[PDB]
């Protein structure tokens, strides 16, 4: 399909990305031991976690996050813009990727860089991407909700199948330098999740800094910040369980059975959702 850039069997937008750069990310891009990296399948909460990590760095202070765009603060490494920015950024770098593991820099796997993998209920991911992308250029636009649902289930969407992305990355979950989080836990107890992030990154927070990190990374505050919430909004609703307002009963039924079949080989305990 020539509405996507196809690279190693995975779909990317037709503007912003270059197959030469994607090859270099895999083969050449040097990961430093001080790097902190956010990994997500698209629409799983990348920007929320980028905001939290920025607010950790600035101790809850908001001037920086309110005056520099979030995509400059946490560049998207496989994108042309992210790639070149990062090779000129001083440690410690913060950045993110949506790459499935077979495309991720080789350099990472023998380094000590810390990655946080954020997963989200793929039914909520499907809804989120549907609304964000549905009128965007340089992707294949679906004729309908039903068609986009079909693509998503078949993995013919940006960054390929959700099921493969997750299978690719789950074998890393017991590594010391890999934190596995979900959007559901992050939404349900933000404080306790930010504390998991602290232990992992070895940071300590004062009580007042914590209050401020919680305040400024909540949905309501981020939504107002135009540097972070980049005519369909990145911050659309910010809940778990919205898939219910959008899946038909038949789509729900089809998806439950595709999920149980694809994920049968992984501990059910990994996925905190119904």
Annotated binding-site members for 3'-phosphoadenylyl sulfate: 43-48, 120, 128, 183, 217, 222, 236-238
Which residue's CB is nearer to K ion, number 137 or number 176?
176
**β pairing state of 10-12 and 5-7:** antiparallel
**Nearest-angstrom CA–CA distance, 35 and 108:** 10
Report the nearest approach of a copy of itself to the CB of residue 232 (Å): 18
Residue in the block written with tokens 């199948």: 161
Q: Answer for the pair 241, 120: CB distance below 8 angstroms, yes or no.
A: no
User: Binding partner of residue 124 among a copy of itself, K ion, ligand PPS, none, CB under 5 to 8 Å per kind?
Assistant: ligand PPS
Backbone angles phi, psi at 59, to 5 degrees: 60, 30
124 binding ligand PPS? (CB under 6 A): yes
144 binding a copy of itself? (CB under 8 A): no
Q: Answer for the pair 54, 64: CB distance below 8 angstroms, yes or no.
A: yes
Dig out the tokens for 30 from the structure.
């040097």
Q: Which of 48, 133, 178, 243 touches K ion (CB under 5 A)?
A: 178
36: enclosing H helix or E strand: strand 36-40
57 is catalytic: no
**Nearest-angstrom CA–CA distance, 114 and 126:** 27
Q: Which of 48, 71, 247, 259 touches a copy of itself (CB under 8 A)?
A: 247
Return the residues of window 27-56 that contact ligand PPS according to CB under 6 A.
40, 42-48
Report the nearest approach of a copy of itself to the CB of residue 258 (Å): 15
Binding range to a copy of itself, per CB under 8 A, among 92-100, 153-161, 173-181, 237-245: 237-245
SS3 label, residue 97: strand
Angle between helix 80-87 and 19-27 (nearest 10): 40
Give the count of alpha carbons within 13 A of 18, CB side only.
Answer: 8
Return the residues of window 158-177 that contact a copy of itself according to CB under 8 A.
none
**DSSP letter (8 states) at residue 30:** P
Which residue's CB is nearer to ligand PPS, number 146 or number 261?
146
User: Binding partner of residue 178 among a copy of itself, ligand PPS, K ion, none, CB under 5 to 8 Å per kind?
Assistant: K ion
Q: Answer for the pair 41, 162: CB distance below 8 angstroms, yes or no.
A: yes
Report the nearest approach of ligand PPS to the CB of residue 98 (Å): 6
Binding range to a copy of itself, per CB under 8 A, among 4-12, 159-167, 169-177, 245-253: 245-253
How many chain residues bind a copy of itself (CB under 8 A)? 10
Q: Residues interacting with a copy of itself, by CB under 8 A?
A: 243-250, 252-253
Q: Catalytic site residues?
A: 98
């Amino acid at each position: 399909s020539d509405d996507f850039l196809w690279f190693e069997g995975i779909a990317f937008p037709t503007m912003g990305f270059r197959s030469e750069t994607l090859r270099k990310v895999r083969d050449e891009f040097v990961i430093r031991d001080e790097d902190v990296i956010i990994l997500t399948y698209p629409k799983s909460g990348t920007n929320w976690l980028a905001e939290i990590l920025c607010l950790m760095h600035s101790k809850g202070d908001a001037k920086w996050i309110q005056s520099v765009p979030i995509w400059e603060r946490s560049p998207w490494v496989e994108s042309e813009i992210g790639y070149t920015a990062l090779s000129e950024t001083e440690s410690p770098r913060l950045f993110s990727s949506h790459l499935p593991i077979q495309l991720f820099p080789k350099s990472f796997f023998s380094s000590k860089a810390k990655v946080i993998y954020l997963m989200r209920n793929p039914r909520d991911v499907l809804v989120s991407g549907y609304f964000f992308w549905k009128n965007m250029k340089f992707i294949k636009k679906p004729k309908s909700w039903e068609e986009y649902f079909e693509w998503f289930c078949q993995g013919t969407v940006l960054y390929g199948s959700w099921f493969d992305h997750i299978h690719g990355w789950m074998p890393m979950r017991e590594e010391k330098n890999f934190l596995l989080l979900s959007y559901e836990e992050l939404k349900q107890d933000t404080g306790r999740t930010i504390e998991k992030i602290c232990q992992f990154l070895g940071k300590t927070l004062e009580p007042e800094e914590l209050n401020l990190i919680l305040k400024n990374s909540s949905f309501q505050s981020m939504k107002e910040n135009k540097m972070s919430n980049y005519k369909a909004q990145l911050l659309r609703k910010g809940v778990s369980g919205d898939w219910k307002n959008h899946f038909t009963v038949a789509q729900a039924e089809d998806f439950d059975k595709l999920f149980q079949e694809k994920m049968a080989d992984l501990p059910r305990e990994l996925f905190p959702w119904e």
